[PDB]
Amino acid sequence: NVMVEPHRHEGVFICDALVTKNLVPGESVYGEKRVSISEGDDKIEYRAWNPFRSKLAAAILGGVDQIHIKPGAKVLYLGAASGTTVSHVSDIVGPDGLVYAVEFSHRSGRDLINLAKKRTNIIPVIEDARHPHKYRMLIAMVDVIFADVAQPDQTRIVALNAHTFLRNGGHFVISIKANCIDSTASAEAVFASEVKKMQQENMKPQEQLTLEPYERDHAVVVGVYRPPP
């Protein structure tokens, strides 16, 4: 019998409970259940990925077609907060991948620094994502931008970082909480507005989905950056 099986998305696994292969066997990050499977000389530990705490997990269980975060990927994560979702991105991309974890708050910043001590593939960037000039000498060109900044001007911020850092034909994964962008617009009016802005900055949405039952009026938009010459 196979307990934990590869998910469709490479680097992800399903036990329906989503899990990622633990980069730091023995350690939990936010009190998540851990599941170690030993057979003979082999051994592999997984980490439970809670969809009520991670918008990315909620999107995966909601049936998103692509996440682009994959083994070996270079990921710029905007809005890294304390590292909950970032820790699972770190598992997915693996030792040959890279996760830049940008977060403004220095409180969450300290949780991120502790998380990165264990995970070599995390770079904490405790800076304001509005001003990429302050940190662009630290960021090699990335394959994916994941954004969860939760601001009304989130999309311009994300686009500013994509212009600087995202490779052509690179992808983005943007989490949009409607009442943080504009609590007096309907969720459909926010999502349509934000998707339009993306398209105007050559961030071409390829798919979108909401996150019920885990979150209300919360969308994830996945797409591709195809900038001009």
Author numbering: 86 to 100, 105 to 318
Passage from the reporting paper:
Fibrillarin (FBL) is an essential and evolutionarily highly conserved S-adenosyl methionine (SAM) dependent methyltransferase.
In this work, we solved crystal structures of the methyltransferase domain of hFBL in apo form and in complex with the cofactor SAM. Only minor changes are observed in hFBLSAM compared to hFBLApo upon SAM binding. The aromatic sidechain of F192 undergoes a significant rotation upon stacking with the adenine moiety of SAM. While SAM binding showed an overall stabilising effect on hFBL structure, it appeared to destabilise the loop W137-K143, with the binding site residue R141 being the most notable.
